[model samples]
Target: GKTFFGQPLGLSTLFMTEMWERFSYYGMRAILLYYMWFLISTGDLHITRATAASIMAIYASMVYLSGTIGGFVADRIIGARPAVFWGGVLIMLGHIVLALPFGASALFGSIILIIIGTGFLKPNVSTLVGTLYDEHDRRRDAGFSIFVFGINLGAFIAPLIVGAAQEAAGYHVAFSLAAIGMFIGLLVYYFGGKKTLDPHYLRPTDPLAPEEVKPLLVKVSLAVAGFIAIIVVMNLVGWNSLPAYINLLTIVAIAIPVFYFAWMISSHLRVVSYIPLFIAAVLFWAIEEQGSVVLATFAAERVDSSWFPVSWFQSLNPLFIMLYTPFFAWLWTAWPSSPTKFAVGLMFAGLSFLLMAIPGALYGTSGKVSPLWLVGSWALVILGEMLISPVGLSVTTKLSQMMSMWFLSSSVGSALNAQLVTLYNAKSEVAYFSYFGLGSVVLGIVLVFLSKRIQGL
Candidate 1:
């Protein structure tokens, strides 16, 4: 039982499952922006670069927001184990759609498929990691951290391999690789889950009250239709500016964290440390989420000729993770509680943003600053991620399926990034880096003091 990292053997199964799932997920994301802006836009019915970034924003929210419901899918209809299996199934098909040359149709097709797929898979796999250890077990936190390292290792390798494939063959073949990646994850989950996952995870935590199912589906159907109705309204009005669409979508996504809490408040929810921890994540996520846009734009604008497809830069986040994960695997176990860990994590992230200000100051924002700054800036964000991400994952070890709410902070953060990146420009480069940097520095300090009253709730 202790054979896998001195923890439950199920950790090994879950670990491999997540590794390849993240591999497929990140590999697709690695080039998705370029694929959108350069390829899709270059063809008929063009899109802008800014719009593509915003699309990425919504796509991220789409996946994690699906994760929010993913909790319900597991808790109500199926259990977490079943949710993950079917989730992988959709993700494989999502990529398979991209491998076909359906153009914009293919892009939207894959987007819709992966949203639910990631929703179920992403949150539940981590949820299953919690099932592996009893509450207060010493190994649980470490195991989550170990699990995350596995998650990132696959992420780290993906853009390199996938991006190169894109560079060499074309988008379709590279996308085909993404399909194969998820297929591998599915096989691993099917066999490994049966052999290793505790049967406890196979049963729903809160099964659907058979009475509520019919009414709920109708309610969901009407709401989904109402939203789709607006797309037709959009076409009739010719209000087809993509960024404006992002503005409306971003507004809703921004409100999502509040939407979750508003519902939870009705359920008489209350907690101490997690509230503060959650806010720190919002601040932390807003800053790092910029990597998708601000950091990416900075690289595309500031750096040289295509070293690899710009997608290769996506690997940097995971590269830093794998490099630093070993040290952190031990760090969290012996050191600060989640409160201080998050506070320090926030500080590291803010510092990463602050570093960008230096290059803008030294060399004018127009041309390249050294790539060292890019590497170093990325290096800092990982420590923050290493510290924060798992603590968020480990949230309900003893605690809600609402821990899926944990990713909402990330979802909300991306929504904010969707808006914030539009403000960034060469003229505002220093201001952009400095102002955003201060936001987190201030957020972290607030956490340090906020954490004082509620010591490790």
Candidate 2:
């Protein structure tokens, strides 16, 4: 491996790969719901809003959950390089499916592929970044920050480019653009990655034993079959209604963390200390993820827009994230109280949604409102994000042995938000915002009161 800018040469490849991958994901996300729920006469799918929201939620949740399996497979079987390569391929294929005009089937098929692909790529890429440096290397944190900047940079640009394409041509065209993004990313990995990435980083961390391989294969096959069976049953039994499916996902979302809590209780006494922080995070993401579903839709239907596509609004969060990252980083360095930061972040998140309710309550949803409303909302949420998100990641890493536990928390929060989106209505958005907003504020206050004890633990 060579060095670039005082870091491993591999860092550049990994950074670019992740950048374009985020471009693909966020690019498609910018218009996915609109494609699902837009008027069929306008080159859209004409699915119900609830159904679209449900699918978005489930898809997001599954992407996070699958990372667990992806990491396990990388360590135990395929290793990091193959995992990333296959993941990129599957992601590209998923977008290509979306590029076709096959309707709901294509949408579902693409979702499955992207979910599996993301599972394999997302976790291993970060692992590979760490492998580029020695354990004691001072450059590790800086390298990660650089990598994170790639994520935000892609997210910030994706919606602007893809949303413009969707506005000019149609949903399929925009999806095709996303496919191209992934294709280019894959090309970079295929050609440049081999030269830059160390072979040492490519191999499995822990290869499976011979006896373990056979049973592992059997279990994997059974899981796949069971997943297929569930899809079949859902289709055949007609239990695929928006409410039912969303409810099922909600159950799973809540149950996984609860089960983990119980499992960890006996061994990790300090685990209970994390409850305040965890609750705050779940509440925070439940509101934050609405950027793609509830907030995006609200921008589309309610916000006054003359020049830009609604999807462009999706970039605001990332833009704010990049802008605020430096300030937040400095603040943490100056004042490193994790609990206070987490609680303040939660408070800010709650305040953002509470502000969103004001416009809806005053003006109603019959016509367009000022875009300033959204701008304000995003600004506040991003502020909250600066407080909680980075701090949460830092705290979770310090507190827990299993990093996946925090990811699960994120998945559940997103899933819960999606469930809420299914219940969102144009007329009742004021109430919707108020309920969740106040809920977050209340939770934040509770967390604040408990922060002292948590900090001690």
Candidate 3:
């Protein structure tokens, strides 16, 4: 059964495919926060810090939420295999839209495309990973960790590529580089996956029932028509605030998991829905996205960037992910449980922000702090992330984003960031960091107490 990396032949194919998909994802992600800030800083976006960040929060948050829509498509309509290919096309074109110098239409168009794409691509690919394992296979976690390493490898390299292009070219030009990465990813996924992946995956595990098929089309059509109508209204002057739109979605962001989990509760998977773990990960990502938001500016204003661009700072996540994956894989193999390490990881993340506050308190938030501060921050947060998944972070930090709980937790992290960031102030940074940091610390302890109970869950 083992053909590559002492795992399976398909692991190698999925690994490379995931890596390049992330290359595009992270490549765009590296600049996404800063690019939005730049657009507003230049007054091109005509938005405030809160609303702009809300849009980013909404996009980042919604991509995870799309698991529902994307899952429906893959599980019912086509299959993860085809959805994966089709998803990459959408993501690639999303980047291409940004590269075009189209105004905010492209901005939102790309976001719409990528969110829909990731919905399809992100969850289903991991579904393929789970499919790689037999029911009796103990290497599931081992392989999950290894698979995540590919994600980080792509994450590690993308910013270097994207950031390099940004310096030499315009922002739109740099976005095109992401498109190129996705295009190559599609190439790798298609040609390689066609040969290496299990042909069984060519069809859905539970193909859609004919009974409900036609009914879904009507609901789908109504929803799509209503959605386009909203866009038309938003484009018109009567109800034209993107901020209000995203603000409403931000509220919906909180509600998404409620209904999703409610549906989960009404199912066979209910027992495994992970209520406590869900609570833990929501706290985890709230800090995580804040890491991107505050850290984006902190990297620019507080850290000495004479050595590199701010985008290079974004690369550190995959950097830490790569360096320690082997170590963590071995560590977790010896002793691993979801709650224990995930809680510890959460605490470390909280502590990372706590440590961040110290620099502002001591050196003052106004002055440029040491670059090592950012280094330590990533190091601490990766400790949290690795504890949760043994290797992967980002969308998988809470692990298995296909589970409504997992994605809900992780998306809520970024979603919470949208709401929390309006309160962030570089001057009163200590209060912001400390308050946020303390909450996670408190939550981590709460999770720790539930560790034993969680293992059984």
Candidate 4:
């Protein structure tokens, strides 16, 4: 009954499912920029650089923002099992739509489907992983670390395979492979989900009372109708402006975290003590999520990429994660101190971006620089990620005890807002890295001084 390097058999199922899902997501993303910027003469839709960056940020933000919706549906309507199953289906279909040659319309359609699908799958999958262990299980943290490794493993491999496919065939070819990857994930989950998932989590976490169901259903249906109507109205009004979409997504990215944190504080006063940690995370993710945005663009325009596509840079963070996650796991386990752990992580993230500024500072962007710049930057980022991500989640859960869901959703919102930095990245690349990077280091130093207080909280 044991699998996954001596963990639960279910862990293997979850691990593989997540691996393939990331493979699909990262693989598509690896070539997405090139797809957007490729010449129209080469069977691609050519868009301006700024618009592409904006769209990319919007898409990334939507993916995280939808987690709230997915979690709600899982707890209220269908259970985690069905939510994951249907989520995987929607994701696979989204990739299929992208694989076809329907141009910009296809891209838009794929985005919508993937956003909804990821909402259903992303949060619930982690929830199911938690269900595999008992409340007091000693293996829980170690199991989760292993699961995180699977995520990076997929992300690392995706760009390699999908990037190569793009080179050999075209963007559509690469996208089709992403679709295939998702299908494989769905197949694994279909066979293993019911078998691997604990019986208790197979149904809704909080099923509506008989009388409550009618009203809840009505409200949900009305919300859905209203959303559909907005899209319909947008089309009818010929609302094709890119800036309008960016502004809307920006509002969403900023508002969700602010509202969620306020609500959490009002709902539970205990969370007030954890604000320092939350502040650290907001700063951390702002720097971390740039891998797909600023870092991706840097790889394309500045880095020596005669060797590989820009998207391969996306793998660097995950690659380091796979390489060093075990070492980080050992590091955290040995120390078992949250305050020092977070400060070190935040410092690493700050240093990584500062590292990014070096080549541009010295060489300017006239020509490609050594790939080592990106490699070093990502190395530092992953070091910070290993420190912050797992430890932050663990500490947040410990602080609020029963409010983990609220904290988790709030964290996603914070990270999505971080992606907005991509918009400003083009204005002054050097200033962008220098300012944010130094900003993070300053925050890390502050955390170090406050480590005692944070730990006491």
Query: Highest TM-score: which candidate?
Result: 2
lDDT of 3 by residue, 139-227 (tens): 78677778888998998888888988887787898999999988887888888887778887777767868888788889889978977
Q: Kindly list the per-residue Cα lDDT of model 2 for residues 1-457, writing each as its tens digit.
A: 4566678888888888999999999998899888887644355455577777777877888888888778888888889999999999999999999888677668778988999999999999998899888889999988988899999999999999999999999988999999999998888887887887778657797999888989988998996897678767887988876566667767777777888887788646468888777877887887888888988888988988987788999999999999988887787679647888778888888899899999867876687899889899999999988877766666887783356677887788888876788778787788888988888888888888888888889
lDDT of each: 0.81, 0.84, 0.78, 0.78
- CA deviation > 4 Å runs, candidate 2: 1-5, 39-47, 218-242
Q: Which pairs of residues collide in candidate 4?
A: none
What candidate 4 gets wrong by more than 4 Å, as runs, is: 39-47, 198-202, 218-240, 264-270, 336-340, 400-427
lDDT for 419 in candidate 4 is: 44
TM-scores, all models, native as reference:
0.86, 0.93, 0.87, 0.88
Model 1, 42-99: lDDT tens per residue? 6843776667777887788667677788877897889999899999999999999999
Q: Pick the candidate with the highest lDDT.
A: 2
Error of 3 at 258 (Å): 1.7
Q: Candidate 2 or 3, higher lDDT?
A: 2
- Which tens-of-lDDT digit does each residue in 1-457 have in candidate 4? 5467767889988998999999999998888867777743355555556667667667776787687677778987799988888999899999999788777768888999999998999989888888888899888877887888788899999999999999888888899999999899998988887777787767898987889988988997997897677767876788757665566556656665667678877774446656767677766776777677678888887777886666788888788877886786577559646767778888999999999888878988577789899899989988887877766666777773234433444444334544455445544888888888898899899989988766666
Compared with the true structure, model 1 gives a TM-score of 0.86
